[PDB]
């Protein structure tokens, strides 16, 4: 299977900022990639469209994917409330890495983070499943609205999302 | 610290 590509159209307080696209590593983690893909297309009747990045730490990562509570306490997977760590074949190698947020082992939901740095200390604890293809500059632009404690100065939003290929 | 967690955010 060819690795699928998804896009996020980002908005800052409603104003369009730009598009970020991701390659999803379905050749390593097909279940984890499939969950993110479907949530990006909304094909199950729910997903990332209109959701926010609740926690952004400059020099670290942008966290989003909580489309039910919008604060880190919510979201769900297409398989149910949570699913297992598929594997840890892939590592947090640098900026642009796409990885699953969790609340400890085997609690993957819908929450994810886009790395803006190498996050090696997270290897083996968080399932890496994708990488930014185009629009890393948009991620960099998103980053400036975060803070050391994660709170964002403006509402950073996924205005639209879907699958490109 | 620098974690990415869902619910209980730690240092």
Numbering used by the authors:
A (entry chain A): 1 to 165
B (entry chain B): 1 to 11
Copy text verbatim from the article accompanying this structure deposition.
Cyclosporin A (CsA) is a cyclic undecapeptide fungal metabolite that is used for the prevention of acute rejection in solid-organ transplantation and in the treatment of psoriasis. CsA binds to CypA and this heterodimeric complex binds to and inhibits calcineurin, inducing immunosuppression. Here, we report the X-ray crystal structures of the CsA analogues E-­ISA247 (voclosporin) and Z-ISA247 bound to CypA. In both complexes, the structure of CypA, the backbone con­formation of the ISA247 isomers and the nonsubstituted ISA247 side chains 2–11 are essentially the same as in the structure of the CypA–CsA complex.
The structures of CypA complexed with E-ISA247 and Z-­ISA247 were determined at 2.2 and 2.3 Å resolution, respectively, with excellent quality of the electron density. We conclude that the chemical modifications of the ISA247 isomers at residue 1 do not induce major re­arrangements of the CypA side chains in the drug–CypA complex and that functional differences between the two ISA247 isomers result from the structural difference at the modified MePmt1 residue only. While E-MePmt1 and MeBmt1 demonstrate high van der Waals complementarity with CypA, Z-MePmt leaves a gap between the protein and Z-ISA247. This is reflected in the distances of the CypA Ala103 carbonyl groups to the MeBmt1 (4.0 Å), E-MePmt1 (3.5 Å) and Z-MePmt (5.0 Å) CZ atoms in the respective structures. E-ISA247 exemplifies an exception to this rule: it shows affinity for CypA comparable with that of CsA but superior immunosuppressive activity. In the E-ISA247 ternary-complex superposition model the distance between the side chains of E-MePmt1 and the Cn residue Asn122 is only 2.4 Å. This demonstrates that at least one of these two amino acids has to adopt a significantly different conformation in order to avoid repulsion. Asn122 is part of the so-called ‘latch region’ of the Cn regulatory subunit. Another possible explanation would be that the CypA–E-ISA247 complex binds to Cn with higher affinity as a result of the predicted structural changes at the Cn–E-ISA247 interface around residue E-­MePmt1.
